[PDB]
Ligand binder design. Sequence first.
Ligand SMILES: *[C@@H]1O[C@H](CO[C@H]2O[C@@H](C)[C@@H](O)[C@@H](O)[C@@H]2O)[C@@H](O[C@@H]2O[C@H](CO)[C@@H](O[C@@H]3O[C@H](CO[C@H]4O[C@H](CO)[C@@H](O)[C@H](O)[C@@H]4O[C@@H]4O[C@H](CO)[C@@H](O)[C@H](O)[C@H]4NC(C)=O)[C@@H](O)[C@H](O[C@H]4O[C@H](CO)[C@@H](O)[C@H](O)[C@@H]4O[C@@H]4O[C@H](CO)[C@@H](O)[C@H](O)[C@H]4NC(C)=O)[C@@H]3O)[C@H](O)[C@H]2NC(C)=O)[C@H](O)[C@H]1NC(C)=O
Ligand SMILES: *[C@@H]1O[C@H](CO[C@H]2O[C@@H](C)[C@@H](O)[C@@H](O)[C@@H]2O)[C@@H](O[C@@H]2O[C@H](CO)[C@@H](O[C@@H]3O[C@H](CO[C@H]4O[C@H](CO)[C@@H](O)[C@H](O)[C@@H]4O[C@@H]4O[C@H](CO)[C@@H](O)[C@H](O)[C@H]4NC(C)=O)[C@@H](O)[C@H](O[C@H]4O[C@H](CO)[C@@H](O)[C@H](O)[C@@H]4O[C@@H]4O[C@H](CO)[C@@H](O)[C@H](O)[C@H]4NC(C)=O)[C@@H]3O)[C@H](O)[C@H]2NC(C)=O)[C@H](O)[C@H]1NC(C)=O
Lengths: 209, 209, 264, 99
Amino acid sequence: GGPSVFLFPPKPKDTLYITREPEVTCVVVDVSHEDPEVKFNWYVDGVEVHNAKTKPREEQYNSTYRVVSVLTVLHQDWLNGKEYKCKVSNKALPAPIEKTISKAKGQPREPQVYTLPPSRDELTKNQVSLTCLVKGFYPSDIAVEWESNGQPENNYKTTPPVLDSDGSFFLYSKLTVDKSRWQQGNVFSCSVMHEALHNHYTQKSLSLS
Amino acid sequence: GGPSVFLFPPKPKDTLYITREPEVTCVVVDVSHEDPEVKFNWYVDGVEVHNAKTKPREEQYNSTYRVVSVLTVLHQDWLNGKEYKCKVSNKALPAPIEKTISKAKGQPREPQVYTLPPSRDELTKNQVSLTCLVKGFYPSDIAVEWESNGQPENNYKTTPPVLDSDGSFFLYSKLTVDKSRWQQGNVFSCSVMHEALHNHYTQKSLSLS
Amino acid sequence: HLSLLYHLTAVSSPAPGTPAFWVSGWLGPQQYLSYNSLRGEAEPCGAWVWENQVSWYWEKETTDLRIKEKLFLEAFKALGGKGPYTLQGLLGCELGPDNTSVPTAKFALNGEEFMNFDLKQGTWGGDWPEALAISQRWQQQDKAANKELTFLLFSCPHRLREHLERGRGNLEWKEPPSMRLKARPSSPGFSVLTCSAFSFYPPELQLRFLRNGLAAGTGQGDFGPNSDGSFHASSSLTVKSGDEHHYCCIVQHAGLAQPLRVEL
Amino acid sequence: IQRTPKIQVYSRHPAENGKSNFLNCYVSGFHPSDIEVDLLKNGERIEKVEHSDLSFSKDWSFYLLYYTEFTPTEKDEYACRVNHVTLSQPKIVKWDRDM
Ligand SMILES: *[C@@H]1O[C@H](CO[C@H]2O[C@@H](C)[C@@H](O)[C@@H](O)[C@@H]2O)[C@@H](O[C@@H]2O[C@H](CO)[C@@H](O[C@@H]3O[C@H](CO[C@H]4O[C@H](CO)[C@@H](O)[C@H](O)[C@@H]4O[C@@H]4O[C@H](CO)[C@@H](O)[C@H](O)[C@H]4NC(C)=O)[C@@H](O)[C@H](O[C@H]4O[C@H](CO)[C@@H](O)[C@H](O)[C@@H]4O[C@@H]4O[C@H](CO)[C@@H](O)[C@H](O)[C@H]4NC(C)=O)[C@@H]3O)[C@H](O)[C@H]2NC(C)=O)[C@H](O)[C@H]1NC(C)=O
Ligand SMILES: *[C@@H]1O[C@H](CO[C@H]2O[C@@H](C)[C@@H](O)[C@@H](O)[C@@H]2O)[C@@H](O[C@@H]2O[C@H](CO)[C@@H](O[C@@H]3O[C@H](CO[C@H]4O[C@H](CO)[C@@H](O)[C@H](O)[C@@H]4O[C@@H]4O[C@H](CO)[C@@H](O)[C@H](O)[C@H]4NC(C)=O)[C@@H](O)[C@H](O[C@H]4O[C@H](CO)[C@@H](O)[C@H](O)[C@@H]4O[C@@H]4O[C@H](CO)[C@@H](O)[C@H](O)[C@H]4NC(C)=O)[C@@H]3O)[C@H](O)[C@H]2NC(C)=O)[C@H](O)[C@H]1NC(C)=O
């Protein structure tokens, strides 16, 4: 029929860290080459606001203009379940498409982080798998990192969450390192960031024992 | 415009276990109430076949007929990367929509299963988290279960895979049990099923130590 | 070139009065033997009732097949689950150049090959979970492994040799086919030619079409048995109506000194 | 793992009206083993139908020969009727004289 709209959330790290910018985005594709102009609006818990920042036309190979509007929400705000909104109006659309996003609301739960060292079996080989289980948390949104010796680590992956029977979620993270390093005793520290974390942050540690 | 089509794979457990039926499905929605009849076909590595089994009309609240065609493929077949296909033809569609599915082809890799017991910290409380890391495997498709004392376990969840840097995937599984049970020594055994598993199956074990 | 082959079959829940387990034994394409779980006894089939056979031959067969029955009905315990099963086995041997046997031992579950018997290691093998289960149940038994070894490396080829000597009469039998070629108006401007071969043994046989002495290939072939161990074959071809009398049909077969041209 | 039958119907000897013969029906290439095969004279089933042992082929699919003695006449019509798990409803194959 006409163009459609997609409304993305901010970055979980960016919703706890002030220093970072939590951008609530509004991306519209399948836009008419004939009628390219689009009239965005924004509504914080119903109340309109004028601090939007629209990026220009970012056309694709498929002859459809792609437009984007960035709102810089507040930190405190988002986490109080303030309900945001992108009202897109175009002549290529008869009526206005409205899309309403928020924090995955509900009673949030303190996560619970434990480390787990590489298993017997695994150690034989040159490489190891320092596990970080993080369970008992609400909501989905959550940042997980590694860091060793005061200094961040690259070599790792982290599964997305899954919904734990109890209602909260849980996660894992498989930081790989070489055997020698782990043997030398060097302390590793799985870091987690989340809404209900005391101080929005906690980190734990893992080392030869 | 017209109806669309979605082509699902068989169940990973069902692609290793003969006893089970590996159904390659062909689900078409948004179908015309006016022109409901649809002409399925099937093509195994190009060669047509006549062992399709079409389920009848399963209409939704949204006035669109929903139709489904089930093909019972072979076990050996699928795993040799035999390329299957659903050719849907309807008067509600001018041309025929064709959808081609297969095994996620490429050099498959033996998975590598290790168990991990609940961490120090966790044991304090009444409940525990018997981890099963499964890494170093290709492809995505893979079955994971738990079983204790010759007998399956319910209380657990398993994250989907994620793509490991090396190219293979990995997974975790968080079987929860009560502390008393684990203490009593009862042996737990994380079971895995996958294409490149020797005998398409392996299981490992976890117990007080 | 011929071969002794047993066609073992068991089912987990048989239509009542049907046998749970049964075997058909073959020498080349001739069925000599027949057994099932109801009757419990290995019997000769067909012309093999009249074989100049030695005492104890048949009760040796019976003895062996009863061990097979047990093994097969044991397999379903190993598999455990609910859904009905069909376990099949193909066991036998074939003679090779130097007074030498070549064995066969494959099995299929619910109609797919899944398991085999490695005559070197003296072990069943296969890597499906179902095959690992059954393989294990058999491998831990009153030397079931040894008996399978003897059955395939000793008994089978000793039988095969015995039947060759004492059953030439049957095996070397030759019956050439009766032939018919007919035209069947089918479509608008078309017609179907059908060449048919009746009552022939052995079953090796080719049908071909010529159109004014030049090859028109073959069309759809069909092949089957008669009640009496003989065979039947037919081949069919689409053809312009009115152009029928131009075609003939040629037939090759061991029971004919040279190929036969078959007119309409 | 589930296969549909192939039905051939043919006489043992060349068909000649008034001369004694056998009619064969050869059901083949099916799985699983349960199958109901009936020979039909003029739409109704024959009671002196004998049949061979249930066996299987190199490709593990099952097969079977049903057969009856008979003396064809010009008027008479024969057919083979098979039921099997894989069939919506009994399949009936007419005995083509030519094949
Ligand atoms: C022309 O091409 C465009 C793309 O260009 C490409 O060019 C071609 C030539 C080729 O080179 C390609 O490789 C290029 O990519 C098309 O644009 C796209 O159009 C589609 C649909 O038309 C859009 O699909 C949606 O995708 C989102 C997820 O998008 C994220 O991830 C994508 C890749 O992973 C990426 O492309 C996006 O940019 C985006 O990334 C995010 O970006 C933001 C902004 O910066 C960041 O902040 C984020 O960090 C970042 N995230 C990640 C991760 O990277 C998806 O969410 C949408 O799903 C909804 O819609 C489905 C139907 O489309 C529907 O079935 C689902 O149910 C789902 O709906 C909702 O589901 C959830 C469930 O929890 C709930 O929210 C709702 O309940 C439910 N809705 C209900 C119930 O109503 C959707 O699939 C795509 O986003 C878009 N590209 C971009 C960019 O936005 C263009 O369409 C094409 N034109 C034509 C005419 O074909
Ligand atoms: C009327 O309603 C119908 C639904 O009924 C509902 O009624 C209403 C009233 C309300 O009660 C609802 O709650 C009810 O659900 C509509 O039917 C649906 O229509 C949509 C789109 O129109 C279909 O969306 C697709 O979904 C599949 C995944 O479907 C699985 O999971 C669903 C829930 O999780 C479930 O509904 C499905 O049944 C299905 O489950 C599977 O079922 C099979 C069959 O038995 C089982 O074997 C499986 O085990 C089981 N799996 C699981 C898991 O449970 C999704 O894969 C599709 O994604 C593709 O399409 C997107 C656009 O639609 C696209 O953006 C994506 O990129 C994606 O495309 C591909 O992505 C992958 C990437 O790896 C690649 O394969 C490709 O590269 C890429 N394609 C490319 C590149 O081209 C898709 O979202 C939905 O499936 C369908 N329902 C069923 C059932 O099939 C109906 O549309 C509606 N009518 C109208 C007019 O609105």
